[PDB]
Design an enzyme around this catalytic site. Structure first.
Site, mmCIF file in Angstrom:
data_model
loop_
_atom_site.group_PDB
_atom_site.id
_atom_site.type_symbol
_atom_site.label_atom_id
_atom_site.label_comp_id
_atom_site.label_asym_id
_atom_site.label_seq_id
_atom_site.Cartn_x
_atom_site.Cartn_y
_atom_site.Cartn_z
ATOM 1 C CG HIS A 43 -23.122 -19.438 81.370
ATOM 2 N ND1 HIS A 43 -22.497 -20.902 82.066
ATOM 3 C CD2 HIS A 43 -24.333 -19.734 81.486
ATOM 4 C CE1 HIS A 43 -23.347 -21.463 82.764
ATOM 5 N NE2 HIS A 43 -24.421 -20.823 82.268
ATOM 6 C CG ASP A 99 -18.931 -20.774 82.479
ATOM 7 O OD1 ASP A 99 -18.990 -19.503 82.364
ATOM 8 O OD2 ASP A 99 -20.081 -21.529 82.689
ATOM 9 C CB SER A 198 -25.945 -21.611 85.493
ATOM 10 O OG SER A 198 -26.295 -22.280 84.147
#
Lengths: 252, 5, 29, 10
Positions: A43, A99, A198
């Site tokens: 992502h 992910d 992230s």
């Protein structure tokens, strides 16, 4: 990272910075798994709802960093991607399932006191460390508070939590490609990853061979450090056969 | 890590 | 490079420990 | 609030 501390120098030498060329800016975290390959969350590169779809060209990789902001003149190394590979079944549509992404560097980086790769888990290592109660460590240059940005790389130690509790804390459908970590409101200890963290690594140190292993990738969460809420990470061992695969087909 | 992710 | 993997040049390699890695190792009962 | 990186990288 919420409720962490500054990392010591060379504490996390596999930590990589995903960096935008213009506006030059911090995109996400990532990790060094060898001298040519980087591991991050899919992502960070492809997220249609935010109109995000970065190309090899859109970015730079920064290795050996401590300072978020400064250009670490004789320490850090900057690289160019030769290519990007995303899990073909990564789900941006409903819950960030799978992910995970791999980036092959244009030229192999040279390791140093500040630059050194993390190991990928084997079935036995995962077998034994991915247990509710067992702590791991997360690092990143992300939000300090849910509502800012640290001057230096931050670190936190967090316990793995039981699937039941993980599932009962949210409305979103959790899959086997995810695990959650944090403390329970009663355990009276805080901390979490947060927006900007992230793609960073959730690592564990094996007690058998005293090597650092990467078990998760920072994926998503609901606010940062909220009671009854937990950070979710991509279960690296489960997506291993895919990783092996691409490395064996495209490089090294 | 972005703005959920 | 993954072969000398997970042994940090300034910690493991010199047999020095970081300030909180003991908290981790202690949780692995 | 990012310090400039060497042109050679861009």
């Amino acid at each position: 990272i919420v409720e962490g501390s500054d990392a010591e120098i060379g504490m996390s030498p596999w930590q990589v910075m995903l960096f935008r060329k213009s506006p030059q800016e911090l995109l996400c975290g990532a990790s060094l798994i060898s001298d040519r390959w980087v591991l991050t969350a899919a992502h960070c590169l492809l997220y249609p709802p935010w109109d995000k779809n970065f190309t090899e060209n859109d970015l730079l990789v920064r290795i050996g960093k401590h300072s978020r902001t400064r250009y670490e003149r004789n320490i850090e190394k900057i690289s160019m991607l030769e290519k990007i590979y995303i899990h073909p079944r990564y789900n941006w549509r409903e819950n960030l399932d799978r992910d995970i992404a791999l980036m092959k560097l244009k030229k192999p980086v040279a390791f140093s006191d500040y630059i050194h790769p993390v190991c990928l888990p084997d079935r036995e290592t995962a077998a034994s460390l991915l247990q509710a109660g067992y702590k791991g460590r997360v690092t990143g240059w992300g939000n300090l508070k849910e509502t800012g940005q640290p001057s230096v790389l931050q670190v936190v130690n967090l316990p793995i939590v039981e699937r039941p509790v993980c599932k009962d804390s949210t409305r979103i459908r959790i899959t086997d490609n995810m695990f959650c970590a944090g403390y329970k409101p009663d355990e009276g200890k805080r901390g979490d990853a947060c927006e900007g963290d992230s793609g960073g690594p959730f690592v564990m140190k094996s007690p058998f061979n005293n090597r650092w292993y990467q078990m998760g990738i920072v994926s998503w969460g609901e606010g940062c450090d909220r009671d009854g809420k937990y950070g979710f990470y991509t279960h690296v061992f489960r997506l291993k056969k895919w990783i092996q695969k691409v490395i064996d087909q495209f490089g090294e | 890590x972005x703005x959920a992710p | 490079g993954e072969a000398d993997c997970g042994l940090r040049p300034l910690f493991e390699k010199k047999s020095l420990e970081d300030k909180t890695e003991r908290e981790l190792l202690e949780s692995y009962i | 609030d990012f310090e400039e990186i060497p042109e050679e990288y861009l």
